[PDB]
Amino acid sequence: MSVLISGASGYIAKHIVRVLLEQNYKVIGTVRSQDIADKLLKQYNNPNLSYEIVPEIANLDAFDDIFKKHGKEIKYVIHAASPVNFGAKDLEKDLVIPAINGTKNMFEAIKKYAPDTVERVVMTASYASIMDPHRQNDPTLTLDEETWNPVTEENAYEDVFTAYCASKTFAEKEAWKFVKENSDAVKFKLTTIHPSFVFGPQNFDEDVTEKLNETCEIINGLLHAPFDTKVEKTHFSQFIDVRDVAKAHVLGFQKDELINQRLLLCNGAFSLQDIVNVFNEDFPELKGQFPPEDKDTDLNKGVTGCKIDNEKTKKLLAFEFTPFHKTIHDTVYQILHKEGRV
Numbered sequence: 290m291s292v293l294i295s296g297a298s299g300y301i302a303k304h305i306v307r308v309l310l311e312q313n314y315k316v317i318g319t320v321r322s323q324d325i326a327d328k329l330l331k332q333y334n335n336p337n338l339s340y341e342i343v344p345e346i347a348n349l350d351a352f353d354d355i356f357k358k359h360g361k362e363i364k365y366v367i368h369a370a371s372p373v374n375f376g377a378k379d380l381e382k383d384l385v386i387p388a389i390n391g392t393k394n395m396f397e398a399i400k401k402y403a404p405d406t407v408e409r410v411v412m413t414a415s416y417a418s419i420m421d422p423h424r425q426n427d428p429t430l431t432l433d434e435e436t437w438n439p440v441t442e443e444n445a446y447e448d449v450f451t452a453y454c455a456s457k458t459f460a461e462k463e464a465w466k467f468v469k470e471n472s473d474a475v476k477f478k479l480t481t482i483h484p485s486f487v488f489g490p491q492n493f494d495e496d497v498t499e500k501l502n503e504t505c506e507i508i509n510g511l512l513h514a515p516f517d518t519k520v521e522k523t524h525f526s527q528f529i530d531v532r533d534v535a536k537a538h539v540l541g542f543q544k545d546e547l548i549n550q551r552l553l554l555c556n557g558a559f560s561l562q563d564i565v566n567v568f569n570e571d572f573p574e575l576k577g578q579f580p581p582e583d584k585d586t587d588l589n590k591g592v593t594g595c596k597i598d599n600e601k602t603k604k605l606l607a608f609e610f611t612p613f614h615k616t617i618h619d620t621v622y623q624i625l626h627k628e629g630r631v
């Protein structure tokens with residue numbers, strides 16, 4: 290009844306491991322190096338938690354060693370390892386290749402060593418593999434759980450963001466392709482989670498460092514920006530709380546109605562100024578120490594960009610999502626409380 294989760298040191302995965310441990314699961318996480326494993330084991334301080342070392346998912350057969358040693362005992366797999374680096378130097382190598390190869394390596398290791406053992410696979414895809422990056426401010430476009438990013442390998446490398454979205458899209462394509470062709474060879478059922486911009490507090494307060502993970506560094510950077518910094522007010526994208534994402538991942542392998550499902554995790558439109566407005570609204574004693582408030586955003590006049598039809602996802606998950614104001618507030622409080630300012 291064990292749960293294996295790849296990339297267990299990331300922002301989202303650290304919340305997934307907490308949720309798995311709260312439900313008294315035996316968890317095997319994969320991390321790059323021994324020192325990361327040593328710090329995480331000390332942080333969780335839980336006998337049910339162990340870590341295996343996978344230093345690079347892009348590389349041939351990266352996950353056979355785990356299923357070599359642990360195959361008999363692994364019942365669920367959560368494939369969350371994928372690079373989120375909007376400062377990538379080499380778009381293929383740093384985003385596309387690890388995303389695709391990591392997913393291919395994980396599924397082949399299951400097929401080779403635990404074909405009749407693993408029951409469910411929950412893969413962390415992205416809203417990026419459902420949305421169209423060129424049409425996020427298009428109110429005529431409606432996105433649901435069957436929509437696909439139309440990006441091609443030809444136009445995937447427009448910039449670092451389109452490359453990341455293509456890496457998520459191409460990786461999820463390979464996963465579903467693997468499932469359709471190996472349906473009689475392997476036993477497991479596949480579920481994919483598609484979060485948008487994930488905000489929320491870090492699972493551990495001490496992980497609040499100078500530079501956070503990419504999406505939460507959006508909030509952190511704005512929180513420490515000079516007062517005269519330009520903040521955009523036009524519609525940016527969709528958000529989701531990290532605690533909702535972690536919860537959805539665990540339900541992904543417990544609930545039979547989530548089998549063969551793509552789960553679109555969004556809970557509202559926002560701009561960078563709407564985030565800044567939470568700084569000024571919830572912590573007014575620090576007004577002037579970050580960009581000022583301005584209620585005149587796209588969101589506040591009803592402009593929310595492309596339509597999100599995830600009623601199927603919300604129905605199947607059957608739990609309520611965390612609203613935007615609370616998500617940003619909990620993120621900001623953790624940083625300010627860590628700095629000793631509130």
Ligand SMILES: NC(=O)c1ccc[n+]([C@@H]2O[C@H](COP(=O)([O-])OP(=O)(O)OC[C@H]3O[C@@H](n4cnc5c(N)ncnc54)[C@H](OP(=O)(O)O)[C@@H]3O)[C@@H](O)[C@H]2O)c1
Binds near residue numbers: 300320344387414488
């Ligand atoms: N953040 C979002 O808004 C968002 C939205 C949708 C989907 N997602 C997906 O959620 C997952 C976690 O995202 P996150 O925000 O938690 O990112 P993160 O904090 O940077 O975590 C990424 C995790 O994956 C590992 N990893 C990445 N590339 C790797 C490679 N080539 N070899 C081995 N390990 C690798 C990282 O290990 P190291 O740090 O040691 O490299 C880290 O543990 C990602 O798959 C991402 O695509 C995120």
